[PDB]
Amino acid sequence: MEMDIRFRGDDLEALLKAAIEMIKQALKFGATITLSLDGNDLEIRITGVPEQVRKELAKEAERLAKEFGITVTRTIRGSWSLEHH
Amino acid sequence: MEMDIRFRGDDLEALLKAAIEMIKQALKFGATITLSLDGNDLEIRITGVPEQVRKELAKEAERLAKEFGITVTRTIRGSWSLEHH
């Protein structure tokens, strides 16, 4: 089960600097991370992550949202978009 | 702590018919629900809900995403948008 999140609420350089620590952690978990833009939103798909890793990455996303004063949203399990990329 | 979610992936009438069951449950929990459109996305803010109620509403959102083949996203705790409406 992948996890999909979006970063928003700042310019792309700033969203990328927020994202980079989560990307690093995902990478070390053995995950595959897919990035793309949707307007001013940064879309992040993370695959190859089991339940516990998704929980940990969600905690990291929360820390980053707080750290940088941005908004992070996460696709809820069962969503059409999760299995139709 | 409020919870913010977005419904997307269908026309507004269909997103509203998906949303209506979650709205009803939120209402009965004693919540205050705020609705607005952002393009084709339905934005839903739910306030006056404690931790356990948010968990239950998140489970309902998952059931609705599955039921209707739509996408539901949720704002992660700590996000700027949660305390800056």
Side-chain angles (χ1 to χ4, degrees):
Chain A
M1 176 75 264
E2 75 188 64
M3 93 194 264
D4 291 357
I5 64 174
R6 289 197 185 192
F7 279 45
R8 57 177 169 84
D10 213 338
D11 51 50
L12 183 56
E13 174 68 23
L15 296 176
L16 280 177
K17 85 164 183 167
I20 196 57
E21 183 67 24
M22 194 179 181
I23 301 177
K24 187 175 60 180
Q25 296 190 359
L27 285 170
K28 294 176 104 71
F29 280 132
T32 292
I33 301 91
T34 302
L35 308 169
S36 63
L37 254 41
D38 180 6
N40 301 321
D41 294 352
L42 175 66
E43 301 177 336
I44 306 178
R45 299 174 52 190
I46 307 178
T47 57
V49 287
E51 177 177 350
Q52 176 66 20
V53 174
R54 299 195 296 273
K55 290 180 183 173
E56 295 171 1
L57 289 173
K59 292 181 67 179
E60 167 73 1
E62 169 171 1
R63 289 191 296 268
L64 295 173
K66 290 174 175 177
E67 186 183 354
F68 292 108
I70 61 171
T71 290
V72 183
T73 62
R74 177 174 182 196
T75 301
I76 293 181
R77 188 173 177 115
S79 290
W80 186 259
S81 63
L82 276 176
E83 298 170 357
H84 299 90
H85 290 279
Chain B
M1 176 75 264
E2 75 188 64
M3 93 194 264
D4 291 357
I5 64 174
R6 289 197 185 192
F7 279 45
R8 57 177 169 84
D10 213 338
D11 51 50
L12 183 56
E13 174 68 23
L15 296 176
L16 280 177
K17 85 164 183 167
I20 196 57
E21 183 67 24
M22 194 179 181
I23 301 177
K24 187 175 60 180
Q25 296 190 359
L27 285 170
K28 294 176 104 71
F29 280 132
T32 292
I33 301 91
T34 302
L35 308 169
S36 63
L37 254 41
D38 180 6
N40 301 321
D41 294 352
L42 175 66
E43 301 177 336
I44 306 178
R45 299 174 52 190
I46 307 178
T47 57
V49 287
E51 177 177 350
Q52 176 66 20
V53 174
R54 299 195 296 273
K55 290 180 183 173
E56 295 171 1
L57 289 173
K59 292 181 67 179
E60 167 73 1
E62 169 171 1
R63 289 191 296 268
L64 295 173
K66 290 174 175 177
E67 186 183 354
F68 292 108
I70 61 171
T71 290
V72 183
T73 62
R74 177 174 182 196
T75 301
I76 293 181
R77 188 173 177 115
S79 290
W80 186 259
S81 63
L82 276 176
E83 298 170 357
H84 299 90
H85 290 279

